[PDB]
Design a protein around this ligand. Structure first.
Ligand SMILES: [Cl-]
Ligand SMILES: [Cl-]
Ligand SMILES: [Mg+2]
Ligand SMILES: [Mg+2]
Ligand SMILES: [Mg+2]
Ligand SMILES: [Mg+2]
Lengths: 397, 397, 397, 397
């Protein structure tokens, strides 16, 4: 068996998606997401100019050898661009292997561990009354878990308040006050629990903005409202930052949508400083690496909570749902819904019912790409915002 | 898909082997080793009286759910008997999944990572001249790595000196002197290096007999002879025992043929106290658990060194060689050869050439069991020896 | 003195019990419990096919040598099956030694340390009103300590809600929601304290279902109700799991009915992460090992809290009560009462009065087995339940 | 002051170099190296498609704000591609600031700390006699410090044996044996010390190939030869890997040419596990980040040892030599010489005399780019090799 061609498809059916297609000599092909929000073309070059020329002629069944060849062989290891390129290759090869086996991908991984996959949606409001209305709408759509974000008085724009953060040709500049946020946000959760009661799962994304003792304070203030998690409370390049938060609160902690390697989270997990790892298939080297992260996590009670924003394409979502159907220590799947225009480019077998997913019984990850339709939507640059404090300091968005 | 029958086959073609066969409703079947040397019938009861009745009617594709169901559902977790029964089930289910995929098992795991699998053999002598002759014979058979064990002056019988340790209806009683051994064994390695030079890989199995500071002493004494490993130097129920050895020597360390769980070796591995993990598919819950142990090990530079004594059947050896062909952090495969009579009961696809194995290209793990021939050889009890010190103290064999 | 015979008696006077009887050449005999709930016949084989043939002809006075011979000599060490078989031997030999001394067993251990032994009973209800009624009934029976378990709204079946968990030929499948439980259970303890006041000792068994930060949350929520203990809050194969719970709550912690070795709890105890060790004579290698566990525990303020469910036979209960009468760091004895039919098979000297036990003054542990009556009740398989989450995930029962 | 244009120049005068030029509205410009060996075009896209469009119109004097804007604002932080793009910007802005000040760059950093900068060169041979000849030639060129690499018997190709490792359109595949290397390399250093005596500084690059206990063994074997350093002994994604090496040898340790962030080496440095940090201006975010790494290093006795292979352009070398002239804890500068054809494209003020450099007194870093000459040499792909073990395993090159 040999790879005879591989190509990168770039399309913008409402936002940019990058997809790798690998084609074998017996006409089976596989696809993988390669989208890196706000840096997309750097991955297109990484694949087209360096990795694809090496793939040609290789036996696609050699998933592990190819993964190690690219992970170690780049010499400069890890990193968002290289690990997203490698994720695209890895997923496309698992898609091929499952097609060759005539099995849905979750069967290759070890079979199903559950009959349905819990998801969460987003409820965002500019103020508290609008936030409560957004929670009602999310519940009305059948979601049993809801991420709640609310505008803060005295702050113009804040994270998560249809929201699509890559909103401009060059980065938008948001302004931020930590103290205004910490004083106000617990009141939002008190009002949501008063209206909606204790059974609904509530999530909150802090979006990198606090220091550890501020996150400790916030976690304590949110304990009465028993959140499913408090996410990304502090930037995590120094993993020891979470030890102080963990010392002071029992609100469960999630982190890691921005990571690309097990080495970004090994210490967070083995020291039991977090409850959910959010690192994704598309941004951290594919299924091969994420199986290892999830298995490592399971020894320490940590559960998977994959990021699921719209900048992860339906190809990532199909791979993630097959992974979610098998992995023992599944926690939750984020679902920020794609638009109809986006979905049409990526026919898929996964489906949603009453707050839960199943991955679909098609062979492979069950996702394809309509190349003729993708070609109708040329790339259009869109970058993520930056965040400044009130004095102008460039802060964490 | 459903399991319609499952049975335990017990045979003694020279020594006892226990095998599980699981049969599906489309006539595909799978087999797994269930042999637990010197306690074999306890696993036969564990499977026949408790686990098989639950398997019937289950979808065999649900490998992970079935693994967790038995691992957690026993309530009394881990342990040699239950984890060997679960290994037999797990391997038989991976054998079925690979047959359903029409692939050799190593392809399901992620494909091959190497073209051949290094093995080691045993060289045993009653004295130094006979040990040197046994090393010559092992080299003449094409082995590039050799475990060297030698009789010690003033000690009647010592470990590893055709050797088959389960030698009696009830346990044989060996006698041991640590100080006689520590004074003599380095001279054996000096003489082997003088005759055979530096290129041959040399291994030594201490067989549980030392305390940590004695193992530190021995490791230091063996450094000039640059061993591939020093194995099982101290009993390892208290994993911190290896910290003191690691403090004092750079001879590489191996342990773990007797373990049945990742929880027996998590601390040894994450603290970098060992170089090779020896825990096997048959004794530690099958491929599902050993993939997790090997992956965990890889984060800490630890490599696989599966035990490979004759009490692991050819079904274990086939599963181990498919695992060895894929796993990135492969170190070595032990090969204590089965006899012709043993091999005839278990037709297999794996082959040996010039010191190395390949697993074979047959679907599944490539091993089968000839039931009609197995039935010619009824069980015959054989227990492992015990070891006493010179004063009678019951020691570690 | 020699052992001339040893046999395994299996009987089901309402549930399965396995008993070893060792007979000496002067007609003194001893008995030990060998019951391993839901895996019983694997221990019967371990004893009949491997250990008993070695016992014959040995001097029964050599308790320590025989213990080490089996513990080390199995080669594959520890584990539920082997450690329960060894417990049966060890207890039967202590029974013989105390008979030869003409003393109740507690005198051999060092004599009595107390005049009576505190016990606790079970109060279980399907809802809060029924739970309160069960607490009243338990108090009316003279108990000064009561384990309270209550059905949770929105959950069909939960742990501990006459309850006998091995309820079926194959495992029953329970369904579980952690979040429903955590939201409700503190209200049960508030209502029990409001009705019954502060003097009664209250216990709760979490039954393995939480993660560490969830157990930290629950322990904090239960602090106002000053429980005697919160038990088995998280699965404990990774003993470091308790460090995070201990960081966050002063509710006292108990664990360990499922353990079989000191190596399952050494780190829990020496780091002062628990208050009570629950590991039993029958499941952890008998009196010889439990004396060592209790003594180790005493250096770190940990007290004994032996498990005492109905699946530990009256032979275990007699041995446990003699141990309880002597051990300095006694905490409490669980008492889930045997039925009349069960008690008739095992005549015993221990007695209950107003919430407390004494072991009895008969030589040995004071328990015997009526072989003729035992023979009226053939084995009948009964397995423990499994537990699944609402999505189907196989969880901890 | 405003940036009015910025462009990426790609040229291959013997090997590929990528350079950013930033032009201000008063005609001052600055340049920075952006070369990422074997992945070059991914950085060209990162800059052209994402970062340059943001630079236009910014005040170039705002070095720190621009650094934080790109480091945090990418969202996906760190990594070889993004940190090399940011390095190019940072160096070009420091070049501009020093031109605006009319000072050589080292004056802006704090002035000179030394009068000359020690360098080392490479001596490589296919065998020992040729290695000794290469050392003689290196000494004859005036070098006082020499990195020695030698071919190993029984190994075809090994690291560092005019050597330019990016030698092919697609990766060359080298083969490796750790045990052959460990047995032989100490003899090379014994022979170099016998011929050349103790005063010459000797360096060795292990090139990622060992495990920690193998590196401990090698460091001990090299102690008699008192090396300046042993470099890159083990892959360092798990920084704790160096703790075991440090436990066992006093040979000084260097690592880090492949790192891109302080977070790749914080633990190596603060625990005193290394002696020299090798991370470079071009690959780790420029002067702004490297000042912080070097200052952090100084608290723990760690000295700078910048990588200096030919794939770091003369623009990197000029920036590195100005940094080297100022930084207090300077250790050494690697110098793998550029060819005449390479040097002609990048006129520069730094000079070499008798083994040492000075950076030059021109304003800025003293390096420029001849755009007309650069345009004569179009890009030509060249990738770094990969390394396989003798069985085919994809290993660390
Ligand atoms: Cl990157
Ligand atoms: Cl067991
Ligand atoms: Mg987020
Ligand atoms: Mg061994
Ligand atoms: Mg309990
Ligand atoms: Mg180097």
């Amino acid at each position: 068996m040999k790879i005879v061609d591989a190509k990168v498809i770039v399309t913008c059916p409402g936002r940019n998606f990058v997809t790798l297609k690998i084609v074998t000599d017996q006409g089976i092909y596989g696809i993988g997401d390669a989208t890196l929000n706000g840096r997309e073309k750097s991955v297109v070059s990484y694949l087209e100019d360096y990795l694809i020329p090496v793939l040609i002629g290789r036996d696609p069944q050699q998933i592990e050898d190819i993964w190690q060849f690219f992970y170690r062989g780049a010499y400069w290891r890890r990193g968002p661009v290289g690990m997203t390129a490698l994720a695209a290759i890895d997923v496309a090869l698992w898609d091929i292997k499952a097609k060759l086996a005539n099995m849905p991908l979750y069967q290759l991984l070890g079979g199903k561990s559950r009959e349905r996959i819990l998801s969460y949606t987003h409820a965002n409001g500019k103020d508290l009354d609008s936030t409560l209305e957004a929670v009602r709408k999310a519940k009305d759509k059948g979601y049993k878990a809801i991420r709640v974000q609310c505008g803060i008085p005295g702050i113009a724009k804040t994270y998560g308040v249809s929201y699509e953060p890559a909103d401009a040709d060059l980065p938008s500049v948001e302004v931020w006050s930590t103290e205004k946020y910490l004083n106000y946000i617990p009141d939002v959760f008190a009002a949501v629990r008063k209206e909606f009661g204790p059974d609904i799962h509530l999530l909150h994304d802090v979006h990198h903005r606090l220091t550890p003792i501020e996150a400790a304070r916030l976690g304590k203030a949110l304990e009465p409202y028993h959140l499913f998690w408090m996410e990304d409370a502090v930037p995590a390049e120094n993993q020891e930052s979470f030890k102080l938060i963990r010392q002071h609160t029992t609100t469960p902690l999630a982190v890691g949508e921005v990571f690309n390697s097990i080495h970004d989270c090994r210490e967070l997990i083995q020291n039991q400083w977090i409850d959910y790892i959010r690192t994704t298939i598309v941004h951290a080297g594919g299924i091969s690496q994420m199986r290892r992260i999830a298995d490592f996590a399971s020894l320490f009670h940590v559960r998977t909570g994959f990021h699921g924003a719209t900048d992860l394409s339906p190809v990532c979502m199909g791979a993630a749902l097959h992974f979610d159907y098998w992995v023992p220590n599944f926690g939750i799947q984020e679902h920020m819904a794609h638009s109809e225009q986006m979905n049409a480019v990526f026919p898929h077998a996964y489906t949603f019912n009453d707050g839960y997913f199943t991955p679909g019984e098609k062979p492979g990850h069950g996702v394809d790409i309509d190349e003729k339709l993708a070609a109708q939507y040329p790339y259009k640059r869109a970058c993520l915002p930056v965040n400044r404090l009130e004095d102008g300091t460039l802060w964490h968005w």
